[PDB]
């Protein structure tokens, strides 16, 4: 059913599936900083799972295939979401409407400031590029379907990914871009995905080290263990 | 099994 | 300089700058041990790095960057570059990784080193993807150059080097599309293939990150001063 | 750095 959708139908479907922006719990230490972020990420994961089920083609996958994709891409997905909503706030990371942080605060947690800087740089990149919401949701779904497609030790997913490419190009053509500007922008956006993968990997590397600072939920741990099981 | 096994089915 | 090149000039430049395929010192009579396997791979990578550094200098736009930026990019991308090279020369060897013409390994041999087989499986999967797509040599050199310029661009008040890099990257994209148009692909097919190729770069990053993680945990066999300094850039 | 040197040659 996903492949039969038009470009507009794909966009509408993705926009409609968008998760809500959650608030943080209402003077930061290492423990307090991690507590807020962990609690927030945990609540976001539940919404992500229901968002994923609404990404066209995802439902067509076996339960195990769905688990694997989400296990691979969860932090990437949180990160691109964070960068997206931080766009209108140069120099800051909008974790929640009531939680806007600068790099200075990233220092509260060892090794986190380096990730903050990467995230801030990504946000600026999106801002420089004038990323549209319709493009954002396309990128986010791509991360979901792509990041774990090989790890699968595949045609359906690749056909869906093609569909999303068509959709991205369709959006750009509407924005009035030239054919050359279309493929250059396409490349620019997809290359940023490599950096988002990089951020996830490095962040994950730290996250499954410090499991014990604060208490992590059973779900958050199972998501983490999925990556730690290979480190 | 996995908590993710649930939630996905729900 | 790099910005005045035509698509055909970019390709011929990249092709001419290709490094040679080096041999390992694999003695078909050892046969193996974690240490020996790693000795071979380490020995090979070290010699490859020397060729990689001189190859980078021939990538259009690279020498326009400050020395410090050149160092950063290579420190970021060295393993990704080795990996895409490995996957490229392994294309015509299903189920096998051609580290050198005299060193063709399968996944079972990859079990010789703890945690390395997981990476082998990902590398094999990547080679399988390239073979499916029938990746061309002209496309390969474009992708490898993109890795060099892109991987470290977001972790560097000049600001104009990052900009210079983006223009060069845009030109490589122009070149890729040019090749696909020449191949007879339709507009939709060009855009689709371009995306397919670039998405693979995300997986090459992933493989490098996971591999690097293992590499700088076990800094065992002599790790040539160059290698140590390259790994150190990522550690810890 | 070594890399620094080889690039510098
Ligand atoms: O990549 S990190 O910055 O993680 C760490 C955590 C500690 C040290 C360190 F170097 C890195 C990551 C990104 C951001 O901040 C860390 C973090 C997070 C922390 C704990 C956790 O259980 C889950 C997520 C983040 C986060 C959380 C929610 C969100 O919507 C977007 C990003
Ligand atoms: O990513 S790995 O597989 O490294 C690992 C991963 C896990 C355990 C381990 F010991 C090493 C990597 C990929 C391939 O095999 C490992 C490796 C390598 C090993 C040692 C070294 O000093 C440098 C590179 C590889 C390699 C080497 C050369 C080349 O042209 C392409 C790939």
3D structure, described in words:
The complex is a heterotetramer, with 2 copies of chain A and 2 copies of chain B. By secondary structure, chain A is mostly helical. Chain A has a single domain, classed as Retinoid X Receptor, CATH 1.10.565. Chain A contains 9 helices and 2 strands. Chain A has helices at 7-17, 30-52, 63-85, 103-106, 112-129, 133-146, 155-174, 179-207, 218-228; strands at 93-96, 99-101. A two-stranded antiparallel ribbon of chain A has the order 1-2. In chain A, β1 (93-96) and β2 form a beta hairpin. In chain A, α2 (30-52) crosses α3 (63-85), α3 crosses α9 and α6 (133-146) packs antiparallel against α7. Chain B is mainly α. Chain B contains 1 helix and no strands. Chain B has one helix at residues 5-8. In chain B, 10% of the residues are buried. The chains are: A mainly alpha (231), B mainly alpha (10). At the A-C interface, α5, α7 and α8 of A face α5, α7 and α8 of C.
Main features:
heterotetramer; A: Retinoid X Receptor; two-stranded antiparallel sheet; globular; B: 10 residues; mainly alpha; binds ligand OFB; Nuclear receptor coactivator 2 (chain D)
Percentage of residues assigned to helices of chain A: 55-70%
Which homologous superfamily in CATH is the superfamily of chain A? Retinoid X Receptor
What does the overall shape of chain B look like? elongated
**Coarse structural class of chain B:** mainly alpha
Order of helices and strands of chain B: H
Q: SS-based structural class of chain A? A: mainly alpha
Q: Which class of chain A in CATH terms?
A: Mainly Alpha
Q: Write down the Rg of chain A.
A: 18 Å
Beta-strand share of residues of chain A: under 5%
Strand order of the largest sheet of chain A: 1-2
Find the CATH topology of chain A: Retinoid X Receptor
Task: Characterize the main sheet of chain B.
Answer: none
PDB class: transcription
Keywords: Nuclear receptor, transcription factor, ligand binding, protein-ligand complex, transcription
Assembly: tetrameric
Entry title: Crystal Structure of the ER-alpha Ligand-binding Domain (Y537S) in complex with a 3-Fluoro-substituted OBHS derivative
């Amino acid at each position: 059913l996903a492949l039969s959708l038009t470009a507009d139908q794909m966009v509408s479907a993705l926009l409609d599936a968008e998760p809500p922006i959650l608030y943080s719990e209402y003077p930061f230490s290492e423990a307090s900083m991690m507590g807020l972020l962990t609690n927030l990420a945990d609540r976001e994961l539940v919404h992500m799972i229901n968002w994923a089920k609404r990404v066209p083609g995802f439902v067509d996958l076996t339960l195990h295939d769905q688990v694997h994709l989400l296990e691979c891409a969860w932090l990437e997905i949180l990160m691109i979401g964070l960068v997206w909503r931080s766009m209108e706030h140069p120099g800051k990371l909008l974790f929640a409407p009531n939680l806007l942080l600068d790099r200075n605060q990233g220092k509260c947690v060892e090794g986190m400031v380096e990730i903050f800087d990467m995230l801030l740089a990504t946000s600026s990149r999106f801002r420089m590029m004038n990323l549209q919401g319709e493009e954002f949701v396309c990128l986010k779904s791509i991360i979901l379907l792509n990041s774990g497609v090989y790890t699968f030790l595949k045609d359906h997913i690749h056909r869906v990914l093609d569909k999303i490419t068509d959709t991205l190009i369709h959006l750009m053509a509407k924005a009035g871009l030239t054919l050359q500007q279309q493929h250059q922008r396409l490349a620019q956006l997809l290359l940023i995905l490599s950096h988002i993968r990089h951020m996830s990997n490095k962040g994950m590397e730290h996250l499954y080290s410090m499991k014990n600072v604060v208490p992590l939920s059973d779900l958050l741990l199972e998501m983490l263990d999925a990556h730690r099981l290979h480190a | 099994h996995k908590i993710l096994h649930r939630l996905l089915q729900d």
